[PDB]
C-alpha cells in the first residue's frame, strides 16, 4: 500500500456533546491499552496578580483529598489498578490524564468526577504543599531553559495576564486562600469550556454513558478574551559567574486558526536544530547547524512555534559561550532573511518531508493522540485529520514562504532575552538593523 | 494484521508487520553490546555507536546525512550491554532508499583514519552529557563491582582510551560480531518479501560469561546529594523466576505511577516514611540480561540519611523473606506489571524494542497475551525464594555523593 491510502485508513475520530456543555470525543484503535484525559480552558492567562500561580497550586491538591476517596485512597486505587497518572498545566490549558487498560476504564471516569468536581482541599495539605511550591521555585533557578521562556513571555506580553508565570510569584503562594481557589474552581471548570478525550481499544459509546453518568451532574452554566498584544522589548539578566548563557529571541506569532502556522513549522525545521551530539557535523543540511559544528560556536539550540488564541511566538532558543554570541545571531538572522527572499524549492521539500515524520512520529501511541484532541478541541474547533494536514502542506511552495517570512520576520519588533555571560550580547537596535537584508 | 516471523539457514531472523501505517520503521537488533569487548578494546562501542554517518563503499558520509533529511527520516542508535540497534524512521513511500543507506553502514563501513580522529573527541562530550544525569556512573560501577569481565565493561568509554583507538581494532570487532548468525532484521510498516529480498543480497555473509563475584565501589565526589544501590545476583530472562522479580519489583516499589504521588502502596517508600522527616526518593532496581540479571534498589537521600534509609530497605525485604505478605498487594503488583508491559509496547518504538530482543535471546516472539498467562501462573512461594535469594545471596553495592555516613554491606 501507499502513504495516502494509509491516512484514509486511519480511525476517524468521533465527537459527542452534552446538555451541560461538555464536549466529548474519542478514537477507537486496536491497542488493548487506553488513556483518557481532561483538557480544558484554564491557566495563568485568566488569573490576576491576586490569584496568580493558583492553577498550578490546584495541580498538587487535586490528587491529595476528595469527598469520597480522601487522602491517598485516591492515589491508592490507581496503583491497585496498575495504571499511571500524570498531569500538567500551561498558560492557557491544563490537563489531567490516565494511562490504563481497556476493561478497567469505567473505574477511571468515576474518579475524575471525584477529582474535578468534588475536590476537598484539606487545609493541612494546603499548608504542606505551600512549602512544596517554594521548594520548587528554588529548583527552577536551575532549570535555566524554563527561566528563559518565563522571562520571554513576561516581556512581549507585559502588562497583560499572559506575562504571568504559571506557578506564580512566591508572594501570592504565601497569601493564597481556599476561597480564591473555590472561586477559581467555581468559574473555569465548566462544561461549555471543557473537553474529554481518549484513545485505544474502546468504543465511543462505552464512554458516552459514563459522561452521561458522572459528568452529567456537572454545572453546565464566564468572561471572554482580551486580545493580548505583542511587544518588541529586550530583557537581560546579566550573570557572568555561570558557565554558559541560555538565550532566546522571538517575534509575534499569528495564533492557532491562522493557516500559515503550517508554513512556519517548516521554516523552524528548515533551520532545524543541533545540540553537540549529532555526528553529521559538517555534513549536515541546515547551514546554521553545519557552521555550529564546524567552528563549535554553540552547544545547543532549538526552535519552536507557540500558538495562542490571537497570537503565538515564533523564534528560537540557543546556548553558547560568551565569546560566540554575536556571530550566531549574525548567521541566524542570515538564515531568516535568506528565506524571506531566496528560498530554494528543493530545500522546501526537505522541511515538508520533515514535518510529515514529525506529526506522525509525534503520534506514536495513545497519549500523544489525546494531547492533540484535547488541544485542538479548544483551539481549532474540530479535529483535523492527517490527510487534511497533508493537503494543506502540498499547496505550499517557495512563493508562500517568501510572503510569510516577509510578514512575520522582516523588520518586525522582536523580543529578546538572556541569562548568563551576555557581555557580547549586542543591542536590540543593532539586532533589528541586522534583521533586514540590505 | 499479524506478525510474520521467519529465519534463514544462515541464522538470520526476519519479521515484519504491515500495519498499513504511514510511518515505516526498521530496527536491526544485533548482539554487539560491550560485553563482547575484551580489556584492550574498551570504549569501542561508544565510538561505534557514533561511527554511524561515516564513509561506506556504496555511499559517502555526506550523501547519507543529506539523503535521509531530504525524505526527513532519522538514524537513531540504541545500544545495551548486550545489544546494538540501528533504528530508523521514514515514510513508507521511500523505504527503498533508506534501506540502502542502512546496510552500507553495517555491511561496507571502511572506517578510514581521518573521519575517526575528528569523531574521537566527541566522546568527551557524550560521556559528560550522561554524567550531568549522575546515575550513569553509579550504575556502571555496579556491573564493574559485581561482575568482572563482560558486563562490567561500561557502554561508554574511559578517558585514556580516547586518542588511542584504532580503525583496524574495529574491523576485527565488526567482522566478528555483525554476523548473519546473530542478527535480526526486524522491520515495520513494510511487507515481508521485501526484507526477504534485501538480506539475501547484502547480509549474505557468515565472549565469556558474567562471573558474579561480589564487589563494592565508593565515590566521595563532594556532591551534596547521595546516590546508592545495593543488589544481589539475580536470574536471567526466560526463566519464570525472572518474572518473579519483575513482579516483586512492583510489590516493593516501581517508581511513581502517580505524578507527585506518595507511593503509599509501595511497601518500601511507605516503610521509610516513618521516622524520616525529609525528602528522599527510592525504587526497585531490576535488570535481566541473557547470561544473568541483577536485582535490588536505587537510593536517593541526603548525606547523613543514607544508612538510616537503607536499613529500612534491607529490613523491609527481610520481612518479605520471612513470609510476612498479603495477596492483594501481589495481584496489585501483577496488575502493575501487566500494565507496564503493554504500555511500553503501546508505541511502535517501544513495541519494536521488544520484538527482536526476544528474537536474539530466544528465536521466537511471544505475543503479550501469552506473557500475561505466565504472569498469572506466578507463586507467592517464589516471590518470597526470590527475596530470600536476595537476602541470603551474596551482595554488591555502589554509591556516590557525600559519604560521611554511608555504611558498607556487612554493617
Amino acid at each position: 500500500a501507499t502513504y495516502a491510502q494509509a491516512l484514509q485508513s486511519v480511525p476517524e475520530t468521533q465527537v459527542s456533546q452534552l446538555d451541560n456543555g461538555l464536549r466529548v470525543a474519542s478514537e477507537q484503535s486496536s491497542q488493548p491499552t487506553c488513556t483518557v484525559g481532561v483538557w480544558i480552558d484554564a491557566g495563568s492567562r485568566y488569573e490576576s496578580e491576586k490569584n496568580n500561580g493558583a492553577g498550578y497550586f490546584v495541580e498538587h491538591l487535586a490528587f491529595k483529598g476528595t469527598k469520597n476517596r480522601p487522602g491517598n485512597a485516591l492515589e491508592k486505587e490507581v496503583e491497585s489498578m496498575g495504571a499511571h497518572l500524570n498531569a500538567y498545566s500551561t498558560r492557557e490549558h491544563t490537563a489531567y490524564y490516565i494511562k490504563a487498560l481497556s476493561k478497567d476504564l469505567p473505574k477511571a471516569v468515576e474518579l475524575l468526577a471525584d477529582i474535578v468536581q468534588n475536590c476537598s482541599l484539606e487545609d493541612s495539605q494546603i499548608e504542606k504543599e505551600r512549602d512544596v511550591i517554594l521548594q520548587e521555585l528554588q529548583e527552577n533557578d536551575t532549570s535555566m531553559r524554563d527561566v528563559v521562556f518565563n522571562y520571554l513571555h513576561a516581556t512581549a506580553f507585559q502588562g497583560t495576564p499572559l506575562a504571568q508565570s504559571v506557578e506564580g510569584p512566591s508572594e501570592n503562594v504565601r497569601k493564597l486562600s481556599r476561597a480564591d481557589l473555590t472561586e477559581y474552581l467555581s468559574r473555569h471548570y465548566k462544561a461549555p469550556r471543557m473537553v474529554l478525550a481518549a484513545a485505544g481499544g474502546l468504543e465511543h459509546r462505552q464512554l458516552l454513558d459514563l459522561a452521561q453518568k458522572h459528568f452529567s451532574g456537572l454545572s453546565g452554566t464566564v468572561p471572554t478574551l482580551s486580545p493580548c498584544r505583542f511587544t518588541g522589548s529586550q530583557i537581560c539578566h546579566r550573570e557572568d559567574g555561570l558557565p554558559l548563557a541560555h538565550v532566546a529571541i522571538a517575534v509575534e506569532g499569528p495564533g492557532w486558526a491562522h493557516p500559515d502556522n503550517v508554513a512556519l513549522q517548516v521554516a523552524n525545521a528548515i533551520i532545524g536544530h543541533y545540540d553537540c551530539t549529532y555526528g553529521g557535523g559538517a555534513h549536515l543540511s541546515s547551514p546554521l547547524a553545519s557552521i555550529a559544528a564546524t567552528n563549535k560556536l554553540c552547544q545547543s539550540f532549538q526552535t519552536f512555534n507557540i500558538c495562542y488564541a490571537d497570537t503565538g511566538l515564533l523564534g528560537a532558543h540557543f546556548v553558547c559561550d560568551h565569546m560566540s554570541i554575536d556571530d550566531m545571531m549574525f548567521v541566524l538572522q542570515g538564515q531568516w532573511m535568506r528565506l524571506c527572499t531566496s528560498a530554494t524549492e528543493s530545500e522546501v521539500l526537505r522541511g515538508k518531508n520533515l514535518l510529515r515524520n514529525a506529526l506522525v512520529s509525534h503520534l506514536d501511541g495513545t497519549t500523544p493522540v489525546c494531547e492533540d484532541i484535547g488541544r485542538s478541541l479548544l483551539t481549532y474547533g474540530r479535529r483535523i485529520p492527517l490527510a487534511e494536514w497533508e493537503s494543506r502542506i502540498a499547496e505550499v511552495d517557495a512563493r508562500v514562504v517568501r510572503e510569510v517570512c516577509s510578514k512575520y520576520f522582516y523588520d518586525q519588533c522582536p523580543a529578546v532575552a538572556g541569562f548568563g555571560p551576555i557581555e557580547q550580547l549586542p543591542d536590540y537596535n543593532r539586532i533589528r538593523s541586522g534583521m533586514f537584508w540590505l | 494484521q499479524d506478525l510474520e516471523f521467519t529465519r534463514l539457514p544462515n541464522g538470520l531472523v526476519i519479521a515484519s508487520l504491515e500495519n498499513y501505517a504511514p510511518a515505516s520503521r526498521i530496527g536491526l537488533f544485533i548482539k554487539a553490546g560491550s560485553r563482547y569487548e575484551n580489556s584492550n578494546n574498551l570504549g569501542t562501542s561508544h565510538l561505534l555507536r557514533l561511527a554511524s554517518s561515516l564513509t561506506t563503499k556504496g555511499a559517502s558520509s555526506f550523501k547519507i546525512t543529506r539523503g535521509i533529511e531530504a525524505v526527513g527520516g532519522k538514524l537513531s542508535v540504541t545500544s545495551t550491554r548486550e545489544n546494538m540497534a540501528y533504528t530508523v524512521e521514514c515514510l513508507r513511500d521511500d523505504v527503498d532508499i533508506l534501506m540502502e543507506f542502512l546496510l552500507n553502514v553495517t555491511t561496507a563501513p571502511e572506517f578510514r583514519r581521518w573521519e575517526v580522529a575528528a569523531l574521537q573527541p566527541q566522546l568527551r562530550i557524550d560521556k559528560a552529557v550522561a554524567l550531568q544525569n549522575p546515575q550513569a556512573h553509579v550504575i556502571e560501577n555496579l556491573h564493574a563491582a559485581a561482575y568482572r569481565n563482560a558486563l562490567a565493561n561500561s557502554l561508554y568509554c574511559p578517558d585514556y582510551r580516547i586518542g588511542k583507538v584504532t580503525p583496524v581494532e574495529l574491523h576485527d570487532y565488526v567482522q566478528n560480531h555483525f554476523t548473519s548468525a546473530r542478527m535480526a532484521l526486524i522491520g515495520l510498516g513494510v511487507s515481508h518479501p521485501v526484507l526477504k529480498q534485501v538480506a539475501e543480497q547484502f547480509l549474505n555473509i557468515r565472549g565469556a560469561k558474567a562471573k558474579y563475584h561480589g564487589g563494592e565501589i565508593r565515590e566521595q565526589n563532594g556532591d551534596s546529594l547521595v546516590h546508592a544501590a545495593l543488589v544481589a545476583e539475580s536470574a536471567a530472562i526466560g526463566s519464570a523466576e525472572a518474572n518473579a522479580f519483575s513482579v516483586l519489583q512492583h510489590v516493593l516499589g516501581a517508581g511513581p505511577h502517580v505524578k507527585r504521588g506518595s507511593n503509599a502502596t509501595s511497601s518500601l517508600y511507605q516503610a521509610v516514611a516513618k521516622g524520616v522527616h525529609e525528602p528522599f526518593d527510592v525504587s526497585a532496581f531490576n535488570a535481566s540480561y541473557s547470561d544473568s540479571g541483577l536485582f535490588g534498589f536505587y537510593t536517593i537521600s541526603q548525606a547523613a540519611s543514607a544508612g538510616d534509609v537503607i536499613k529500612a530497605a534491607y529490613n523491609q525485604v527481610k520481612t518479605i523473606a520471612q513470609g510476612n505478605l498479603s495477596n492483594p498487594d501481589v495481584q496489585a503488583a501483577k496488575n502493575k506489571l501487566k500494565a507496564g508491559y503493554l504500555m511500553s509496547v503501546e508505541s511502535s518504538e517501544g513495541f519494536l524494542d521488544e520484538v527482536g530482543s526476544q528474537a536474539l535471546a530466544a528465536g521466537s516472539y511471544t505475543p503479550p497475551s501469552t506473557v500475561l498467562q505466565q504472569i498469572d501462573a506466578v507463586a507467592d512461594a517464589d516471590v518470597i525464594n526470590a527475596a530470600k535469594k536476595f537476602v541470603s545471596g551474596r551482595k554488591s553495592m555502589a554509591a556516590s555523593g557525600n559519604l560521611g555516613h554511608t555504611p558498607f554491606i556487612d554493617e
Binding site: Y278, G280 | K74, S76, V77, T80, D126, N133, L155, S283
Partner: peptide, 16 residues
C-alpha cells in the same frame, strides 16, 4: 534503572 544509551543523527542524545 535498566540504563540504555541512545544517540542518533537527529534524535538528541539520551540515557534511558
Amino acid at each position: 534503572r535498566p540504563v540504555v544509551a541512545s544517540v542518533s543523527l537527529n534524535v538528541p542524545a539520551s540515557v534511558r
